[PDB]
Amino acid sequence: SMSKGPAVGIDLGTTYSCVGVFQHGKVEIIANDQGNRTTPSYVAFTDTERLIGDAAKNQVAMNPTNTVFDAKRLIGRRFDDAVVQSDMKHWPFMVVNDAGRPKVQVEYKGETKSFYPEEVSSMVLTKMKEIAEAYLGKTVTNAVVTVPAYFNDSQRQATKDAGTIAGLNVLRIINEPTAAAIAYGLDKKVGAERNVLIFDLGGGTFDVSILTIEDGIFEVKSTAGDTHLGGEDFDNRMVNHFIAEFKRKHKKDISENKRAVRRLRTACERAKRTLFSSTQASIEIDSLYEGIDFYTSITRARFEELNADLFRGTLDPVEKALRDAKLDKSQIHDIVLVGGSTRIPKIQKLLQDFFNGKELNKSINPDEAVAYGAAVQAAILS
Amino acid sequence: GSNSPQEEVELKKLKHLEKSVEKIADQLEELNKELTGIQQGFLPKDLQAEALCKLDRRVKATIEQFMKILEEIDTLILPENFKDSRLKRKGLVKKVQAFLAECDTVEQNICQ
């Protein structure tokens, strides 16, 4: 058997999770068995087995009703919560009421089974624990797990319970914006009280948090955002643009052909990523629809135009959080970028311009900053 | 007759994708033989429905594997001068699409 390993930091995300470890004086974000530094927060139930992470996400098209995700949207909530009722309409899996508490209901090995959200999140946490052990070659038990700043007592407790069910010794539960500030060493900056704005646009949610750090104490001053905003919305604008382009060029509508739309959507997702660092992206899809080859391109400028209202709209929760925190924008000492969509240059430009040219804390991979801070906290608590 | 060493790289990528398609096509071939076997076989008419619907998981897995191949082929960018690569890419996508049509035929014949 393996020897005892270090404590880890885990970012349990709505769509993806990330695990880091502090060692040799730095944080190492751990790649999973497929070499991915983030792992889908997905659990699938099949005729023969339970699948977690990439293996679960990879078969979603094959088994949609029995592939659970978004458990974080349900954890610690009552069935009648407005959020649960609104969210349920859009999920392919069933959510049932068990004495006031939501449960996901699935078919597993030919039988009807139901799980509490913390049981689903415990399975994701077990995979994160296993990812850390496979990399370290040592057993992992101790972890710092993160939660959104707006989580209430029930949501926080249910997350701690997911950790316990997973066999983790949860050293501490810390807020996601606090983990991001810790990653950048914002509590270590000398001087007076610091006002920090965390701009977190990743994994299908948009969260703005304002924190004040004074003598190493973090206080959440305000939170704002959009629960359902992310990369998929930006990808969809591109898809609409291309479907319209195909109609103009060929007088054919590819929208009802699910495989054609999927090939196009996958290519749009990739082009969007190319646009993070390139000003243009090319797409070549042979035989997209009715044997027609679709060879096209999109500039970063066109991508920005298609998404102009959505990008400029990210400043509304920034203004709302500033008003709730009773602070002028000029009073914000540090701006931190978290989440994959913050890689979009236009989003960075809009935020930097809003803060009158102020440099943004963005050097840490945005997808990993929260796990990075959690791993730093885990090392401190060891 | 201006064949470049650069195109050899793309042709090698396409050959690997062709090999990957051949493996999935072997899975489809077994599904087709099993479907034919059930439709033309001696199973009591009462047990045929169950045998056919047992192919569901495999046919969906086969469809998904082909869709992942198409998404990988869709990442290639081939200049006009790479005529051999473009022809190989076109031929491969057409081969995958014809296999997906065969998968769709299996789905029309099971779990009805």
Numbering used by the authors:
A (entry chain A): 0 to 381
B (entry chain B): 149 to 260
What does the original paper state about this entry?
The 70 kDa heat shock proteins (HSP70s) are an abundant family of ATP-dependent molecular chaperones, involved in many cellular processes including protein folding, prevention of protein aggregation, modulation of protein complexes, and protein transport between cellular compartments. HSP70s bind to extended hydrophobic sequences in newly synthesised and partially folded proteins, in a manner dependent on a cycle of ATP hydrolysis and ADP/ATP exchange. HSP70s consist of a conserved N-terminal nucleotide binding domain (NBD) with ATPase activity, a substrate binding domain (SBD), and a poorly conserved C-terminal domain which terminates with an EEVD tetratricopeptide repeat interaction motif123. The two main cytosolic HSP70s are the ubiquitously expressed HSC70 (HSPA8), and the stress-induced HSP72 (HSPA1A)3.
To discriminate between fragments binding in the adenine sub-pocket, other sub-pockets in the ATP-binding site and/or potential secondary binding sites on the HSC70-NBD, we screened wild-type HSC70-NBD in parallel with two HSC70-NBD mutants (S275W and S275F), which block adenine binding to the HSC70 ATP-binding site. In addition, we confirmed by SPR that both mutants abolished binding of adenosine, ADP and 1.
